[PDB]
A = this chain, B = another copy of it.
Amino acid sequence: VTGEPLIKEKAVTGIEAIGRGDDRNKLIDFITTANQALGPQAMTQFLNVEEALRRLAASGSIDTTNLVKTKAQLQQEAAAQAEAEQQAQQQQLLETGIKSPAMAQAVKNFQGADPERAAQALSAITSETGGIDADQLTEA
């Protein structure tokens, strides 16, 4: 609109220079007084807990990261953790926790008594159910 630079300047002299730290202390003391008044239940909806790992490390120079678990790395590790817990959940016990080897004995009966009759009876069992390719059964 005007052409003036988007950033301007300011001069600090005397008590202002001495008490810029006092201004910081005023902000922090307001935050701390709010935390005292409200407690752990403060942490919801007015005054930010101001989250000190990333940006103030980049404030006053210096960069981010290093100790900072980056949002990308944090998401990757969360996904890995979720996959590990799902691996825990998949076949959760089962192979031994299941009641009794009735399926093992039934497999014994399939293989023993006329394997072709076992195949046609397994086809009947997969007819009780469906919607699954039998070509996926031969990839286990």
Contact = CB atoms under 8 A, between A and B. Distances in A.
Interface of A: 21, 24-28, 30-39, 41-57, 59-60, 62, 66-68, 93-112, 115, 118-122, 124-125, 127-132, 137-140
> Could you tell me the dominant secondary structure of chain A's interface residues?
helix
Given A36-B32, A109-B112, A53 B42 contact: yes
B130 A139 contact: yes
Contacts of A59: 46-47
A59 to B, nearest CB: 7
Contact of A124 (B98, B111, B129, B140): B111
A122 to B, nearest CB: 7
Given A94-B96, A102-B105, A115-B121, A38 B53 contact: no
B52 A43 contact: yes
A132 B125 contact: no
